[PDB]
Amino acid sequence: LGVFGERPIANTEYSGDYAQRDDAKDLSAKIESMNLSARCFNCLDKIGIKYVGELVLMSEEELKGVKNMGKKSYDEIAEKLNDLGYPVGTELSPEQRESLKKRLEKLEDKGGND
């Protein structure tokens, strides 16, 4: 216990529009389309998150929960998700996501798992 010490680098503390949803048309894209590093995409592909829609449907608690996430890799994941308009994990009025999941099922037929 104590009242003195030293700290790491400061946060950006930036702010903007709370959320936006008109850009959710672009979610049929490959996650690779946002110029990610391959280590990020090689995480996302193995859990089966192959599209920006699937990353957008990866709510923050799922997103923290891959097996080989990598510190830099999640950060550029989240900021290239943010480049669409919505930084990943903003899940406070998500009800459009069930409509997304049903539309995403029609990007292409492929298979299933259990």
JSON list of C-alpha atoms in Angstrom, two decimals, residues 44 47 49 51-66 69 74 77-78 81 86-98 100-101 104:
[
{"chain": "A", "resi": 44, "resn": "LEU", "atom": "CA", "xyz": [-10.25, -14.15, -37.23]},
{"chain": "A", "resi": 47, "resn": "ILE", "atom": "CA", "xyz": [-12.60, -18.95, -35.07]},
{"chain": "A", "resi": 49, "resn": "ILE", "atom": "CA", "xyz": [-14.96, -14.74, -38.40]},
{"chain": "A", "resi": 51, "resn": "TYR", "atom": "CA", "xyz": [-16.19, -11.02, -42.81]},
{"chain": "A", "resi": 52, "resn": "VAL", "atom": "CA", "xyz": [-16.49, -7.50, -41.34]},
{"chain": "A", "resi": 53, "resn": "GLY", "atom": "CA", "xyz": [-20.10, -8.53, -40.44]},
{"chain": "A", "resi": 54, "resn": "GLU", "atom": "CA", "xyz": [-18.72, -11.41, -38.33]},
{"chain": "A", "resi": 55, "resn": "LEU", "atom": "CA", "xyz": [-16.20, -9.04, -36.58]},
{"chain": "A", "resi": 56, "resn": "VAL", "atom": "CA", "xyz": [-19.10, -6.52, -36.01]},
{"chain": "A", "resi": 57, "resn": "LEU", "atom": "CA", "xyz": [-21.08, -9.51, -34.52]},
{"chain": "A", "resi": 58, "resn": "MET", "atom": "CA", "xyz": [-17.97, -10.32, -32.37]},
{"chain": "A", "resi": 59, "resn": "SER", "atom": "CA", "xyz": [-19.14, -8.29, -29.33]},
{"chain": "A", "resi": 60, "resn": "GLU", "atom": "CA", "xyz": [-16.24, -7.18, -27.06]},
{"chain": "A", "resi": 61, "resn": "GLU", "atom": "CA", "xyz": [-16.55, -10.20, -24.66]},
{"chain": "A", "resi": 62, "resn": "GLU", "atom": "CA", "xyz": [-16.24, -12.67, -27.62]},
{"chain": "A", "resi": 63, "resn": "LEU", "atom": "CA", "xyz": [-13.45, -10.48, -29.05]},
{"chain": "A", "resi": 64, "resn": "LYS", "atom": "CA", "xyz": [-11.27, -10.65, -25.87]},
{"chain": "A", "resi": 65, "resn": "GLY", "atom": "CA", "xyz": [-11.86, -14.46, -26.03]},
{"chain": "A", "resi": 66, "resn": "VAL", "atom": "CA", "xyz": [-9.96, -15.75, -29.14]},
{"chain": "A", "resi": 69, "resn": "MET", "atom": "CA", "xyz": [-5.43, -12.47, -30.23]},
{"chain": "A", "resi": 74, "resn": "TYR", "atom": "CA", "xyz": [-6.72, -6.57, -31.55]},
{"chain": "A", "resi": 77, "resn": "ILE", "atom": "CA", "xyz": [-8.76, -4.93, -35.58]},
{"chain": "A", "resi": 78, "resn": "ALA", "atom": "CA", "xyz": [-10.73, -2.47, -33.43]},
{"chain": "A", "resi": 81, "resn": "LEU", "atom": "CA", "xyz": [-13.61, -1.80, -37.54]},
{"chain": "A", "resi": 86, "resn": "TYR", "atom": "CA", "xyz": [-18.28, 2.05, -35.28]},
{"chain": "A", "resi": 87, "resn": "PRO", "atom": "CA", "xyz": [-15.35, 1.06, -32.92]},
{"chain": "A", "resi": 88, "resn": "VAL", "atom": "CA", "xyz": [-15.84, -2.63, -32.01]},
{"chain": "A", "resi": 89, "resn": "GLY", "atom": "CA", "xyz": [-17.52, -3.39, -28.63]},
{"chain": "A", "resi": 90, "resn": "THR", "atom": "CA", "xyz": [-20.14, -0.51, -28.61]},
{"chain": "A", "resi": 91, "resn": "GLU", "atom": "CA", "xyz": [-23.06, -2.85, -27.60]},
{"chain": "A", "resi": 92, "resn": "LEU", "atom": "CA", "xyz": [-25.70, -0.62, -25.87]},
{"chain": "A", "resi": 93, "resn": "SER", "atom": "CA", "xyz": [-28.48, -0.65, -28.55]},
{"chain": "A", "resi": 94, "resn": "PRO", "atom": "CA", "xyz": [-27.52, -3.62, -30.82]},
{"chain": "A", "resi": 95, "resn": "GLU", "atom": "CA", "xyz": [-30.99, -4.91, -31.97]},
{"chain": "A", "resi": 96, "resn": "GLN", "atom": "CA", "xyz": [-30.14, -4.55, -35.73]},
{"chain": "A", "resi": 97, "resn": "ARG", "atom": "CA", "xyz": [-27.53, -7.40, -35.24]},
{"chain": "A", "resi": 98, "resn": "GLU", "atom": "CA", "xyz": [-30.07, -10.28, -35.58]},
{"chain": "A", "resi": 100, "resn": "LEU", "atom": "CA", "xyz": [-27.26, -8.64, -39.85]},
{"chain": "A", "resi": 101, "resn": "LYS", "atom": "CA", "xyz": [-26.68, -12.31, -38.79]},
{"chain": "A", "resi": 104, "resn": "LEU", "atom": "CA", "xyz": [-24.65, -12.63, -43.32]}
]
